[PDB]
Design a protein around this nucleic acid. Structure first.
Lengths: 134, 199, 256
RNA sequence: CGACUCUUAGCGGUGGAUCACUCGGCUCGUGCGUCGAUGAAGAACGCAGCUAGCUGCGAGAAUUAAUGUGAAUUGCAGGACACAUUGAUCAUCGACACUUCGAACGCACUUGCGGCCCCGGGUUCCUCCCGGGGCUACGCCUGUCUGAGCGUCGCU
RNA sequence: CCGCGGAGCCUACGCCGCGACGAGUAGGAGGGCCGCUGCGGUGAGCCUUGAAGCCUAGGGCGCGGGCCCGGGUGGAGCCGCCGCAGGUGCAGAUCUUGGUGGUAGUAGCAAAUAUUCAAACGAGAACUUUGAAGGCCGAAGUGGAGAAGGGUUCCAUGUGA
RNA sequence: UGGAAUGCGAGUGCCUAGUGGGCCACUUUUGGGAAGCAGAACUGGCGCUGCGGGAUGAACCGAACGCCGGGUUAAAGCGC
RNA sequence: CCGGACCAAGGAGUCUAACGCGUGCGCGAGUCAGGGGCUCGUCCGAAAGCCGCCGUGGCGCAAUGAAGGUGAAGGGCCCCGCCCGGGGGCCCGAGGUGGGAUCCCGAGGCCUCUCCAGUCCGCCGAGGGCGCACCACCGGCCCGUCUCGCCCGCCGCGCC
RNA sequence: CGCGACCUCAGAUCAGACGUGGCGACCCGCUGAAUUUAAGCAUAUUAGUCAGCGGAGGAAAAGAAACUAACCAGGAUUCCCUCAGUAACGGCGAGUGAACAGGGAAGAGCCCAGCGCCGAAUCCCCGCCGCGCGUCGCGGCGUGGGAAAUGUGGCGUACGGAAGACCCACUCCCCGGCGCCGCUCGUGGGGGGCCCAAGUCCUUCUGAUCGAGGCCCAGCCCGUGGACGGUGUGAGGCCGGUAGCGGCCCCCGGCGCGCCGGGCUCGGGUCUUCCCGGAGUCGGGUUGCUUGGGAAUGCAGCCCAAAGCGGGUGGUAAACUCCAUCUAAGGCUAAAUACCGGCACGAGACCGAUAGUCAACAAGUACCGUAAGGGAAAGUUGAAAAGAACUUUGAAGGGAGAGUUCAAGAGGGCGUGAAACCGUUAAGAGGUAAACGGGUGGGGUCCGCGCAGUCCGCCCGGAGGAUUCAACCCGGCGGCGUCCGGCCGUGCCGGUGGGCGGAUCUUGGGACCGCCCCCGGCCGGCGACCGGCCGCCGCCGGGCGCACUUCCACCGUGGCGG
């Protein structure tokens, strides 16, 4: 149970912060779990979703084992777009269906200097916690 | 307005009292704040007793209360002088000083003097510079037995059977009290009539 | 409510002669508000009848002797299995209702050992019923930061902390209580006596010094002793069936 | 027989009650407790590729720089950022910048009229014309300079 | 005792018996397993296999306050019991806010003389435009320009909500 | 021999709301020509109360009231 | 007579303080921490617990007088110079009268298969006895005030 | 009659500074009503309150006795409890109304003028140099200006002080620039940034789940984390978070310890001799306001107008006398206290869009008034726009199909969708306006696992099946009761007790008393208190008992009871 007198448990305050969060806070809010194989390789459980990330949908109408590429992270709408997750309008054109990143699993993450750095930070912090518990 | 038996009540609610109403919902908050101030002060003056300086013994000034003894504002200049403590070094030692208190009697003077001597013997004086001590206290009593006092320093707090002798048995307690009150009342006019009779 | 609520407008009655009620009305023009009622408990936008005030008496003081009486009654009821089961506390397979466990529990540090101990004392079914009682509160309290409700589980009475509070903290329903600070709000959860309590032996032995026997006054409280009984034998059946009472009776009149 | 009228039920409508919800209030409590002639509060007018209002900003105008962050913003478009020859966005914010009124300050409140000292361009020390820059308000303190007085005196 | 056995009971704040009585404004008192909202306990309560709410020629209960069930609609919460606390029950107040009728397809669209023929555009013309007639303001004008005040109403194109 | 008859269980304390405009009738009665006028006494009534009868009606006559079945009456009636 | 065309939603004895009576609870000649303080950062907890070497204080436990002031013991049994009423000694510890729930004794009755002589318990019981609370009445004590009258005491001999 | 000095004034766009205005919840100084109550009304009350004016700060104001008291005396201010609805005031009516003592929170004390001593020892400005240098201090020099003898500085202020003589101890300090570490104990002291656990496992429901079952070990996994949000519906383990004296990075600090530089480097007792105070102020008269202050509590205007063993106070005016207490007319000072404005936070038995702030929304907005000012209404498609392509009629609005969606009985003021009012369909009725109460009757919608009507126990037969039963033996578990033991105990003695109290005695320590607990012995009772023998009874399991016993189902239009 929360003990910090400076952290709010209020419904309205937590919802207000969520719904008009700045863009860089919406980045960490829109995090997705890594795959079991990736969680084994890097000692990390979840990463913030990013464009050109290979994910699969685990909930909803478009659930399946297909692997798609993230093509748009609409942080204002709190949704991401995947390659094959789409439907047809009345006209005939095709539109992407927004999927919340909490409902997808990263199977391959785009790798760069910044992403390697925060993968190592999350593994180092977790390893310290495991050592402290032991 | 009145209905049968009752009390003639005069409530003082004719003066727009609702604008000046003191609620005490902050009472628990001011207890914690007062408590944390005490704890911070005690740490800041850590070796010192954290209950303020030593106060003298004082008698309450009225018939209702002259059988009781409480703490005064400070030791008077007469008892400080008898104890041999300079009035400008008492405050540094931890002795409260009240320059405006008089000493009508000697027992109260001697009681407060002995209270000052007991404090001086019980006092540990740390050197100004720990590396170089001079006219202070020894290492045994300083870094081994120094503790901060918790409550007030030297708290101030408030006849065998015998055979009754024939003299006090034949004592007129009520009669003496009656003549005594008459003697005080009639003292002035008895002397004036005696002087007039002399003339 | 706010002291200014319903009274920030400027509004006067139109008086009689205008074929309308004599309620105060907003002055001016050029808006819906003009001519509308104000300053009244019957008017939309007006103040309430007797506006609630902060200097209502919120707090009650109970006599110390009565508060101590309530704690003794709550403790006595917690030792009767019928009263504890009447609270729905699932006391079966529990070896003794005045459950006393050693002082090693006070030194517990992991929630795993807290759960294992409850399983070994057969007090885990109480936690399972607390889990089964977790549901959503009905009403406006969901918007008032009181969304979830659940039933109460066992109360654990300790003497020294040594980590016992942290170990049992995460288990739902469990309340931790210091024997020297016994709280009637946690021993009779809803004014009903009969809450299941688990004691450490240190808290159990401290309990005689706290409230005293009938031969000894309380040692840890100055000037307190246990309340006296106004009726020594409460067994009505045995008293009525005793030969002394039966011999003094007239024959019963069964004929209708 | 209709029509018309009345009642009841079904369905459909002038209507927006009830219920459920709530990035809003109200009340209590805690910590801080900081405006301004270095120009405040408050006004006015402007500023976006398409943008009226709200919001943010001031001619560098829906923002510059810096630091942290680390791949977006998004209603459409356009092009950055090659996503280290170090940086989209957002946050923070200590650098820079900050139109006209306003205690409001050259005089006056009309885009009115000046004065002094400099700079550039026409002509050449007309400072005549145009443009730019710095000063030019009241009260009051210490000091400074210039003064007044048949004020009190000294030497003449 | 060849039968080894014999209904129900007694939430004692419960159950049973007997006798008499029953109007009511103002007003007083009692009971309420009458109703509304929130809190503490409790129902190993109910609920997307369908909560609240709403409708009902359905089945019923209670003297009543009201309540339970069936059916339809709805789409996410709700209720029972022991206590606690109220901003807790409306036909009135020329009550407040909103919505709606009958009146009623009614009153009315009657101050300053007046319009007609043809064509054009157009889905559509008594009312627009062009032409031709008949009339009016009749220069102290129904003319041509300004001051206040208005502030884009000025001009062109398009639309006909 | 509980010192007439008859009937009935009494006594007592605290707190206490509403009311403090009345009106009608037999008898008695004051002012007034008198009044469905004004003012009194006693009792009953209406107000607070419905029910049968007086066609109708605050007060008259009868009778006072929980929801019902049978029987019988009061005052008043029994041409329709 | 006045208000009401119709429907929905809102809409009026509340809160605080002070008294008074009644009732539930705790303790009881006492009772009450409410202001303050001590206990881990305090989800709950702004709660709860404890102070007694915080009961200061409030109310109650004493009244009366304007005030100076004064300030609540009754009975039973024996003895007495003196016969107007007071003194002395023991024993207890608010008196007496009439009512008075309840409680106690109880002549005489009821009886276990029968008679007799016993031990009991119960039940009815005429009569008595101790009498709760409360009521009425009569005594008594404290304070104020008035009338009458004789004494006593002494660091003050007093307008005590 | 020129040149100087001083004095009193003046001007300057002179060199440097400072004030103004705003906010105003809390605070300080003024000014200041009436509504109201008195059942009328004028004093009174409302009330020194609202409105008006001025001035600040994070607090303000107050404040170290010209005090209280009368005691065995206390001892600055401020705040809380009490004093106290009291003393007192009041058409003594209505009403108003403090203080001292006592208990707490906090606690802290000091400085001039005057009298004196010291060659003005003093201060501001301007330069230069050595410095130091976060935006400015030190030392020197100045044959550099000015202020100040019409009085700066050091010592010293009622608690007395100073100066000499004697004795004693001998100095324990401050500031600026630098390094150490605990980097403030609530864990770093504070600010900022980035991180740190466990199911989305198997089977099912759904439009979508976060739903419902299950997960060997006695129980899925973590739990110091089961607060809360988000996510297609309800989530401890999907995500952010949450817990943790958890980790890492940057910055800003204070308190202590060490280095350098600068300043100062002096006290305490006893004796002797000296010095010692704030004036148009106090006080008195009078007037007006104010106060609980009453022959005047406080404040102010005018008149009078001091003293020094004096003056002020001692709650009834005055004279005389005694006593007590303080030392006015100059000044500074933190804490405890206040806070409806501001910047950040936390929470709630509060409201839930006619409520709650006027304002949940482009709200102090639209709009109104010349202006001061007045001042609204207005939330909700859907999980996702997937917001209806295309065909067709119409000039279009608007329809018919088609399509999306779980759902258009969700189609851009679109959740649900009541009533009033209306349209249509179905049924019924209709000349005393409708409507109503009580009785029936007719018709209609729905309802009744309605449409051959009950169901239990015992007995009687017929025929079928299977066996334990009845008794006996073994094992297990219960229920009941001088037999024993451990307890729970009153009382009663012996104490290794060694304990708590006491307004008992002491000869702080002790003795004495009363209890409390414990030890041993004796002594009574089982029920919210335990065992073990010995019986008696009951139940269950197993064996034997192998059929006139026992049990299970069917039939009879069976009999009795309900």
């Amino acid at each position: 149970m929360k003990f910090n007198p400076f952290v709010t448990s209020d419904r309205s305050k937590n919802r207000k912060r969520h719904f008009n969060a700045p863009s860089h806070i919406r980045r960490k809010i829109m995090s997705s779990p890594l795959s079991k194989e990736l969680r084994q390789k890097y000692n990390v459980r979840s990463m913030p979703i990013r464009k050109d990330d290979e994910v699969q949908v685990v909930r909803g109408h478009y659930k399946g084992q297909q692997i798609g590429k993230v093509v748009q992270v609409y942080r204002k709408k709190y949704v991401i777009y995947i390659e094959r997750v789409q439907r047809e309008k009345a006209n005939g054109t095709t539109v992407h269906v927004g999927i919340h990143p909490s409902k997808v699993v990263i199977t391959r993450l785009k790798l760069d200097k910044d992403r390697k750095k925060i993968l190592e930070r999350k593994a180092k912090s977790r390893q310290v916690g495991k050592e402290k518990g032991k | 307005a009145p209905s049968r038996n009752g009390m003639i009540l005069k409530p003082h609610f004719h003066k727009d009292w609702q604008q000046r109403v003191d609620t005490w919902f902050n009472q628990p908050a001011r207890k914690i704040r007062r408590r944390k101030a005490r704890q911070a002060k005690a740490r800041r003056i850590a070796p010192r007793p954290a209950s303020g300086p030593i106060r003298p013994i004082v008698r309450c000034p009225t018939v209702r209360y002259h059988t009781k003894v409480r703490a005064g504002r400070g030791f008077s200049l007469e008892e400080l002088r008898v104890a041999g403590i300079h009035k400008k070094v008492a405050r540094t030692i931890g002795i409260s000083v009240d320059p405006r208190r008089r000493n009508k009697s000697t027992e109260s003077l001697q009681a407060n003097v002995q209270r000052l001597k007991e404090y001086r013997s019980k006092l540990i004086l740390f050197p100004r510079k720990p590396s170089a001590p001079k006219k202070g206290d020894s290492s045994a009593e300083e870094l081994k037995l120094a503790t901060q006092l918790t409550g007030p320093v030297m708290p101030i707090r408030n006849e065998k059977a015998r055979v009754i002798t024939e003299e006090e048995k034949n004592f007129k307690a009520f009669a003496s009290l009656r003549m005594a009150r008459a003697n005080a009342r009639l003292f002035g006019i008895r002397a004036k009539r005696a002087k007039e009779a002399a003339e | 409510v706010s002291e200014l609520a319903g009274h920030q407008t400027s509004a006067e009655s139109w008086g009689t002669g205008r074929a309308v009620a004599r309620i105060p009305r907003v002055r001016g023009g050029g808006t819906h508000r003009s001519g509308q009622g104000a300053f009244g408990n019957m008017c939309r936008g007006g103040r309430m009848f007797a506006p609630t005030k902060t200097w209502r008496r919120w707090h009650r003081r109970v006599n110390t002797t009565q508060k101590r009486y309530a704690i003794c009654s709550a403790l006595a009821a917690s030792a009767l299995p019928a009263l504890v089961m009447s609270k729905g506390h699932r006391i079966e397979e529990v070896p003794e209702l005045p459950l006393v466990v050693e002082d090693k529990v006070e030194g517990y540090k992991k929630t795993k050992e807290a759960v294992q101990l409850l399983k070994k004392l057969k007090a885990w079914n109480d936690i399972k019923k607390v889990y089964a009682s977790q549901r959503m509160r009905a009403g406006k309290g969901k918007m008032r930061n009181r969304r979830r409700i659940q039933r109460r589980g066992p109360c654990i009475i300790y003497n020294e902390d040594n980590g016992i509070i942290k170990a049992f903290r995460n288990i739902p329903g469990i309340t931790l209580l210091n024997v020297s600070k016994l709280n009637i709000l946690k021993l009779a959860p809803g004014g009903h006596v009969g809450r299941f309590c688990i004691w450490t032996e240190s808290a159990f032995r401290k309990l005689d010094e706290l409230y005293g026997t009938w031969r000894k006054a309380a040692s840890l409280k100055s000037n307190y002793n246990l309340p006296m009984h106004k009726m020594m034998n409460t067994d009505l059946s045995r008293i009525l069936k005793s030969p002394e009472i039966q011999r003094a009776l007239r024959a019963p009149r069964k004929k209708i």
